[PDB]
Amino acid sequence: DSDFSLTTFSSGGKLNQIESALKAVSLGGQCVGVKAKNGAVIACESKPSSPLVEKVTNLKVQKINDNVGIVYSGVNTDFHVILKSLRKASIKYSLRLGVEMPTREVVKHAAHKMQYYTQIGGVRPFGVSLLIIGWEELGPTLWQVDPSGTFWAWKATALGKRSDGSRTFLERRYSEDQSVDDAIHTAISTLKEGFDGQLTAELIEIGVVDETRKFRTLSTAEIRDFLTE
Amino acid sequence: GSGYDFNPITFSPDGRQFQVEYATKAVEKDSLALGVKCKDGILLAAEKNLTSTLLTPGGNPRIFWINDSIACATIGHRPDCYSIVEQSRNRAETFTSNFGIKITVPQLASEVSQQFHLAHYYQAYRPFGCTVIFASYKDDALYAIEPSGAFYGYFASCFGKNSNLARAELQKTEWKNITVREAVPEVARIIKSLHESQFKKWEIEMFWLCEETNGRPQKVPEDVFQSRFV
Amino acid sequence: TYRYDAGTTTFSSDGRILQVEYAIQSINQAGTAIGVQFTNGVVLAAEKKNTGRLVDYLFPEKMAKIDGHIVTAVAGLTADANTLVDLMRTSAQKYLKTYDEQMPVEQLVRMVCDEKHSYTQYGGLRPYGVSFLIAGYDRHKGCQLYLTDPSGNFGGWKATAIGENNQTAQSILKSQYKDNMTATEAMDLTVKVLCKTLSADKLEFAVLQFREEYGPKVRILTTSEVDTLMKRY
Amino acid sequence: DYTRSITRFSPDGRLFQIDHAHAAVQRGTTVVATRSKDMIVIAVEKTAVAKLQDPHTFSKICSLDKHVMCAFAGLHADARRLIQSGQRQCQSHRLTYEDPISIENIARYIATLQLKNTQSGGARPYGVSTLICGFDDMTSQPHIYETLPSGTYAEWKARTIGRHDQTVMEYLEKHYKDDMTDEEAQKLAIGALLEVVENGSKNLEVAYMKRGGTMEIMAEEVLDALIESTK
Amino acid sequence: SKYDENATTFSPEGRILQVENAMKAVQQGMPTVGLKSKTHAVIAGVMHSPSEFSSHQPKIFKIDQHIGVAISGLTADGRGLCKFLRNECLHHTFCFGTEIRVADLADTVALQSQKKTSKVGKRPYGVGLLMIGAGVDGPRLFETCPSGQHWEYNAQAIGRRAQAAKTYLETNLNEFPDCTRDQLIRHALRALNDLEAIALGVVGIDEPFTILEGPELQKYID
Amino acid sequence: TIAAAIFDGGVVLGADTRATAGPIVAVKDEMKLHYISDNIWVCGAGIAADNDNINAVISAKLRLFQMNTGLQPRVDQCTNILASRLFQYMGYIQAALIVGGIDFQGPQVYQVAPHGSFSKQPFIAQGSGSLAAISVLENRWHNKMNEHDCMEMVADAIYAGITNDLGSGSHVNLCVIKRENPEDKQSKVIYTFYKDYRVPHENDRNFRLEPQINNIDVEVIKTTERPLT
Amino acid sequence: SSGADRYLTVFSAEGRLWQVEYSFKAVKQAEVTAVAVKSKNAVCVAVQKKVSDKLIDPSTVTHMYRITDNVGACLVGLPSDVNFIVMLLRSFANNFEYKQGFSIPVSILAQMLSERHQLESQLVYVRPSAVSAILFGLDGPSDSFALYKIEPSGYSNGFRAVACGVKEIEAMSALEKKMEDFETPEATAEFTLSTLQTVCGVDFEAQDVEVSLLTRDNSKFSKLPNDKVNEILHAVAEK
Amino acid sequence: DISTYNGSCVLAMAGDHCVAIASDRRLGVNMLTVSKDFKRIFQINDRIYLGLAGLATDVLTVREQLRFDVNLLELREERPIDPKKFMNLVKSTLYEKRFSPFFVTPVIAGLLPETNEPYLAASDSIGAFAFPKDFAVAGTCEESLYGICESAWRPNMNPDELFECTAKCLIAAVERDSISGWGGIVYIITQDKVIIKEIKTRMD
């Protein structure tokens, strides 16, 4: 039979498949988030497997809806599954309620899906942690959703490779009163610390929710400008 | 396989599907069956090593009807052989139901390789310990599906015990340059030469789909070829 | 084949569902959640799992309002806790839809506990590694506090604690909990128990309070309110 | 859906999962059911409750129906599911048959739920022994069936389940009488539990169903009076 | 050994060890002999005797008016297979109004057992059948195996002691085709050494399948 | 009355703004032209809820399609989805739609009948005023007409339906799907929505008794006030 | 710790899907290499064609497959898995054309294959399909040649040039070292076949390689006939 | 008919930063007056009220399904549902039953959260929502309300004047609808308070 949970509690009260999925996240490419006063940023290292790869065809920084965007660290394919699920959920939310799914509701839906796959049988957890940025009534909000479906808000974060050093670097360099420009610069800097070699605009993707409340993925030109500014 | 050979859907660290190749070994253990695409038709011979002399001489078919124009020689796990034969008949019947036409051996081979593949692709199934050689003279097709589901069209297919020597012998004859009637002596020669003396009573179940049968799957008449051997 | 099946809904030689015991351990390694039932209401106070200077305390990680009359605190996996919170909210609203009455606290507790127990007894799926302190109000039992564990076993508590150092919190509650407490007194007791068994930012609070005219109200204290409560201590 | 054979025979012919469910029952608290001609008394040991635990509406005793009392020993959630099924079944019997479900019938139903869990693939056995008691009719003799995790059920003059079942059962056998009165049955149950409770007034609760009546919890004052009379 | 846990697991030598275990279950059943002539088929079986005061449990069954099966192995599996065979016979009579052929019933039994081995959770039928049927295709004897394959035999012996019966059948194999119904029953009885424990179901191109036990079989015990 | 024609560089959809609750005007400023995607709009006749929901559902489907696939929704794609959906309801969803849009295949106007039939036509009129509108479209539409000529023609068709059809009335809303650069056929497909493109003055309420004579005396049995909280 | 991580598609203690990587190994077990080069004017996929018997009909030993009239798929890996993914891609394209009313783009088909490989790598009861799929073809909406490569993991990416099979690493290195914005479809085909010939180390004859050169003149998928392939190989040998 | 089975008369109205939503109090079984205490207007939240005109059955079914939905949405989002968002919720609830429609027509009278602007949303039984800036009408008195309000409504009615027309413009409609009436109740939602005035209509 299939429907037995392969994510189960171990003797120490630990879901070992959850820790395995978190490990998959920790080997899944550095992604950073930075909450500005007037927005939030989700940058990420997008070093293609080869230069022949077409960057736009597989982007880690993705838009869930007009106001919510998402980046991930972990398995790209089940991130795409999570992203399709979140876009579908936000479209269903707009159909039912006439507005884009709120950032926290998108985060809760991602967390619910990940938890579901942590509990149902025949499946593994999602090997992705999501940094979802979007606005709410009280301001911009960066959220992390773990393979376990546990979500929580952040001021700044890193999820993928070398994300511990990146998170320490953000602890040292992140400030509350940053602007969206300063948040983008902080995200680029965090990626640079978490990345070896020359960190160019083509090797990173930045998504931003700015004063307008709308999520936009910065093009390579905007990323170049930020790198050179 | 260090544990990678119990679940069919499990890849070996080398990418091998150990259950699938164990099914292939089940195929290799079975008596050889070979199809040859001849100019007048396609001849499916199947060596039948009668374990017991009490077996009905005109029975225990290795070659089966799939259509009015498709025959299916079988090698390997006889239960799986007949399961795949019935699933190929069902696939052809469903093909006619959906499209109103008779399935072709290449298309039947694809659809039945679908089931072969499901065996080792979704869990809870067992790989089919059988190779099925679908021959159709209407299609001029001789497609063998292996236990993995890998199906290929052949000029001369052969699977089972001594199938390598049988293939080598089949290479020596340009079957498409000879008819099924004059291919029967050559195929019988090959099977007899490669036949194991461990069995004193044995048969060569020979079907052909030819102009003589109008492409129909017909067991070769005993007058044309005496399958019985002692 | 069940080669890698853990037999989650399977007894052990001791008669314990090992998965449920491990879920209980997971809870005991999670942030402390204390419930204190005072004269009219209950104070729930949980330790946020995700804290730090870089964490944004926008939402209650462990506190979840189930309905106008029921609030919950979480100990253990906040994810499956959120799943059970969604189920509890839906069950409370289904009861309201069926009866036009707020779901009695014990019934909502029984519903979430039946979900947990169904996972412990059927399906071969891992149990919900969450323990709920469900504070609530209903006209039948007044203000109530229920501790529910992954087994689906729940009990009413005047005061109780789950999560990390839950035994120390329980002992402090025994020493200092008194009946007929005021909202302020119970909030002070919960803050004292949390501090003695562990920062306002890391802590989150939720007061259920029943006023005779306004009814039962759940108020999950925000960051500033919890900071004020902590500074009062 | 998950359908693993959780309960299966061991080479020695035992269903080890049923044994583990019995172990769960044993780790459950002690219940004693006793019968007088016109009364049924279920005395359950309250679990050790601190000063912080609400002692009301958490007794192991339950009413499956206006004529059927139930008490359990073992996993509280398993017993909650069993009691929910039993109450649904009592109402279903009233729906299908105007008559109230006989105590034999409802005890059979609960024991058959336990049997199904020992037979259903992917279902854990109920780690619960249930003392299901009541009166079939006004003139019917009181019945006290004990249903085990194995799904076996048997009627008893007086029975105990849970921890100390050995000791409480020995007390019942030593002190049972054929024609005990209501007071005598109450005293029998109360003393049988008193032998294995640290405190008499606190750790012990009693619920009695008289003939032509519903489940009735003992008053704390009357319970204390009976406890002191026994001692 | 480690490959002998499921009917779905092939062994490294391309074998389904659980299928072979069900086969061994069949081999440990009571002796069962089948014989085929040009016009009649017979299945004689030494019905099992669990105790001296237990009537021998029937093994020669009546499936169709011209088909009968001798089940050797797990009796309950044989009875489930016989219910399946009755379903197939009923559906064939419904569809075409004629009696299904024993070859078709053997094919259906083989398919059912192969399904029991091709999916996890379901187990090979511990029972092996000797199905004799005299239809339009003539008299035909089939040994259906737990693995999900059937063999058409002129004669066959299955279960315990099957080797001696098989050798006897081989000795008189070439006699059977022209042997009379009584001669075929006598051959079956000779091949199948235990009288009361021996049932014998005989079918013919004309005569339906009928079971003879003890007294009814005395005329042929010889 | 809804209509939609193709001009040289795009599509002009148009609709009246009346929704009828039987013989009574339920809505006098109803929106029947609905955004499906930046390149596709759908005007709708029939049951107002049917049109609203079918248009919202297909807009959500194509928004998901564009978010996931990154591809501009096609007018024929929108029409195919609408036709399949309306066909599976066997005409129960009474939404006689006009899908006007632009994609790589230029500007296209399709009609989708409530029963799921569809058709690409240079100009279409649907609704109770479809005949009055289609007279105007027949006598005015020509190949490669310009944006303003098609705007005036479609507005005059909607106005013909408004004037002549009782089920049509109030204002003429237009939408003009075009490309931001007429010269470039790969330029972004934009839409300009002309709310109240025509507000027929003769259809305005000419008279109003401003000192409304009223002899109904309101007697209050009970007054209870509560805070708005 | 149970060994599910190494036999099923669940994460190991290192957070790796061992079965997905073993399906990569199974893809390399195809013993063939495919090199696809997508220029502005054409997309040429050349996959070396190995027939193991002289008695196998070569026309049936193929790695190029028609998914739609437009979209071609060079599938490298286990022949059973290759057939399964061919029929799965064709079913995806058919369902897309039925739901959407137009032929599936290569990008959407690649995404659907990526979703299938994600459900294989997440559903423990489904094996990762050991197929590296080079989907290619002229996307009409963009009027540009799409070239996506989907790994058995489901890792789908559009490529200016990609490789799959045994020499995927060497072929990718050669592609990213010598790639150009080739002016003509003939140039694209020459580069594709030259890269494949170099990485394989064997001078190819038309029979030994299947080439699909989708140009704007011929945007429909089709394996180039052996005469055109021979002309391309001669052009490669010309320099 | 089942739409006129329970005579209904709901009338929302826009004022100056204030909405009114009035309803006849009758529960009538066709021509029989069962009650004069029927509630058709329900507070959805502090600044959203829902007047459900139609089958008392469906009035309560849709009020309680919408309460279910809004309570869940406010628990999940921890904020009150917006008048537009509640309108879309009502539209979804009514179109979910498109093939078996509720026989209730909603009238949502709210104040927009920020600008306190009046928000009227009237729909048919299946969620085809109008957003009149003047007045929304529903119930068996629909045409009567349409006429009286079309003549009577004036912009920028303060809560007193808004109540006056809600009451008068509802009294005129119910007193022409035989099956609706038997008293009225007007909820005036202003920026800071809700005034629920029970108005005397004819009781015949």
Ligand SMILES: *C(=O)[C@H]1N[C@](C)(CO)[C@](C)([C@H](Cc2ccccc2)NC(=O)[C@H](Cc2c[nH]c3ccccc23)NC(=O)[C@H](Cc2c[nH]c3ccccc23)NC(=O)CCCCC)O[C@@H]1C
């Ligand atoms: C030109 O020809 C115009 N004609 C009118 C009638 C538009 O006003 C239509 C056809 C229009 C389409 C439309 C599209 C989008 C929004 C609004 C309108 N149709 C209507 O307005 C329909 C007419 C109608 C009713 N029943 C059928 C059946 C088949 C075809 C057409 C119709 N009106 C409605 O749908 C009503 C709207 C309504 C009623 N009271 C309301 C209060 C508040 C808001 C809206 C309300 N609804 C009903 O009649 C109930 C239907 C229940 C079905 C179970 O548009 C073209 C352009």
